[PDB]
Write a protein that binds this ligand. Sequence first.
Ligand SMILES: Cc1ncc(COP(=O)(O)O)c(/C=N/CCCC[C@H](N)C(=O)O)c1O
Ligand SMILES: Cc1ncc(COP(=O)(O)O)c(/C=N/CCCC[C@H](N)C(=O)O)c1O
Ligand SMILES: [K+]
Ligand SMILES: [K+]
Ligand SMILES: [K+]
Ligand SMILES: [K+]
Lengths: 418, 393
Amino acid sequence: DHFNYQNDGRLFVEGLPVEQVVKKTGTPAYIYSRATIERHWQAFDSAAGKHPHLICYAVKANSNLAVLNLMARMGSGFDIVSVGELMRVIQAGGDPKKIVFSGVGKTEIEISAALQANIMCFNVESISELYRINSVAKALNVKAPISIRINPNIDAGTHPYISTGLKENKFGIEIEQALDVYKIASDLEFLEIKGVDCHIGSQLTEIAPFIEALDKLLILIDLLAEKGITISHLDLGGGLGVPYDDETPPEPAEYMTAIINRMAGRSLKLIFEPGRAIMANAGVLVTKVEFLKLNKNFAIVDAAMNDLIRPALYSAWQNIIPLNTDYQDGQDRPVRSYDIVGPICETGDFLGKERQLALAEGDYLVIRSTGAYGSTMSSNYNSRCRAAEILVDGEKAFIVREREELKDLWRGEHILPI
Amino acid sequence: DHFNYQNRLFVEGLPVEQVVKKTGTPAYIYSRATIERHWQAFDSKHPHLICYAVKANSNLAVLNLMARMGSGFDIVSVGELMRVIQAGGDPKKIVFSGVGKTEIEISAALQANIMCFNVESISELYRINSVAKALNVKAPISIRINPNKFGIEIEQALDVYKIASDLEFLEIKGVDCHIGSQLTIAPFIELDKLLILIDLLAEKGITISHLDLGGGLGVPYDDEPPEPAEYMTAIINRMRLKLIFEPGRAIMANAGVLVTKVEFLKLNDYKNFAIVDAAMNDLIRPALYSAWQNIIPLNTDYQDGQDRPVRSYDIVGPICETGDFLGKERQLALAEGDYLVIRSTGAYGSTMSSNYNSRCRAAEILVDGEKAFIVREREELKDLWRGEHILPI
Ligand SMILES: Cc1ncc(COP(=O)(O)O)c(/C=N/CCCC[C@H](N)C(=O)O)c1O
Ligand SMILES: Cc1ncc(COP(=O)(O)O)c(/C=N/CCCC[C@H](N)C(=O)O)c1O
Ligand SMILES: [K+]
Ligand SMILES: [K+]
Ligand SMILES: [K+]
Ligand SMILES: [K+]
């Protein structure tokens, strides 16, 4: 990424010092690198090269309009999970023909809207859902393009977590029943089979499971050919992991080449739905130290679990680094071991534990790797306003989401008449 | 609880099916009577104030109910301060907790002339004093004592209470604590150590006008202890002071439910799923804490002749994570299209909700006898991207 300390000592985001942006906007603030976003999307797109492909960015990772728009300009497709996401993508100028719609709980209203926007494909997750789609397509007199989200029989002795996740969880149709449901789809008049889909998990740090999944889906495609069902594309979902702490996942290029090499001599169109791998390290969250409480030690900062929930919800480890490596204001900064915690009234409200840091009250800290599943999971708990989000381009910073104002908190609320 | 089966499930005088028919699902539904009863149970001589913990449920109508009964409020942000004022609450009956209070929040609270700041750090004393000084007022204060990022350890109580005394624009009014939540009596009482501390402060010349015992009193979610009356008694009996209480959950938890519609049933030999239209962005307690929330049908005796084989279901929402669930392994008789009611969601329900997956926040409805009011309108899609802009290249 383009978050880089300089000979100066000061942290920069592309051409701008981070301190400079947060001085205008205040904290807490999400800050995104345009260059990092673009580089990361391209790393995926290029690596797929001559093989017929679409990159359907997973909107759920970060749905900000400016962010989406960056993708839309580069010609990206989008993977969406709601009508809210559909409208976000259209708003941002994304091509609805390049939209696939995932989700186990799609409503008739959402399916109608997506049909009327003429999206590429519905990635279907239940039998009940097939009937619903067909039923809505019928009422509009169109033909709904569909894949089935399939759960391959990944080998558990080689990928135990992925394998049981597939088995235990609400997503997809188990491969053992693939043909049966693909059949039902074929029999349905207002559906039109276009593809096969899967998504095997998230933050995966190995190529093997992806390949394993591909293999079994190719086998399935072939079995479907023989049964006189034609398959125009194969959607391999997202799930490619990133370095948060010490992990070394495959980079997008390597992940893609393995997948392409496995495509051997086929012309089948490959759809990918990455989210995290594109956005995670394309953003940070900046926060200001309010107080230090010394005993265990606490740095109390102005960001909290409503701004970033990943640590509280998943025990995610997110690196926390200072805004300057060489402070020359002569303030006393004893290195100590701090829990970094926010103002919210729960013990669960923390951003990181046991960090070795040299801090004075008033300092700014940067939480790395917060570009994915950061602002999208944010809330107003404790009636805190959602953070500003800023997009940096070279030497220009643009506010791509304004900090909420207090009077927005109770918008649409009503007291009882007396 | 005025959520009661009566034929069909009713909320006070109204069938639940009737309200959700107008508003749609998902929807939070609150009982006015239950809220009032629960606040009164606590209130019902010894000089006291009940400072409802806004964080549990900060909806304006809800806050207003408390305000009408003369309640005080415990707040943790300027956002909560403004909510309480907006709902017609008395700022003189507001105490302000929180480890991370900003100068801006302290200023606003001073200017609104609140009862007390429950202080959690030394640094914070200086900040308050510093802002009070700049406004030329005297900030009323307790120290939150730990008999966690929270509080001052009792071993250092006197030392910091001293520092406070030495500060001119602060004025020591009280002693405060909050020991945890969903407790679940013995730990409460084990008060004792704070009274001892008060006395040690008297001897040091300091005087303490009030003692704030926080919230934390638990409720029945599944099979769980003390009702408010009994909790209070034990505290009174063990007393003399003016007692401040900050209950949240014990007032609101079972004063509300969340209603949701079954979209699909996915059947497998291995596991079954009811996919509903509510999710972890509407109610995060199961995903975040593995909280058990009871999930019950809208009707015990369905007379539409649909086939409802009893099965074991996980109840899950439309959000794209395995973590998005509302409850696990429930024995339920369901058909697609049925409405389910998730109980005990009046506290830490909507207040922790978000827009993840670009889902609009649920409508919230307050029932009074035979009248239902929409106390929070469902968000519209275009509210999702409020304040967002694409780059102009
Ligand atoms: C059908 C489908 N496609 C694509 C993706 C994108 O996956 P990615 O490449 O971003 O790993 C997901 C993510 N579904 C799961 C999201 C889990 C993230 C969690 N809130 C977190 O913060 O880690 C998905 O469910
Ligand atoms: C000063 C103070 N008063 C009252 C309460 C809560 O009162 P209760 O409702 O316990 O009577 C809390 C913390 N409250 C702690 C967090 C709330 C629980 C979590 N979100 C949950 O859903 O279980 C607090 O910090
Ligand atoms: K067909
Ligand atoms: K957002
Ligand atoms: K004083
Ligand atoms: K715009």
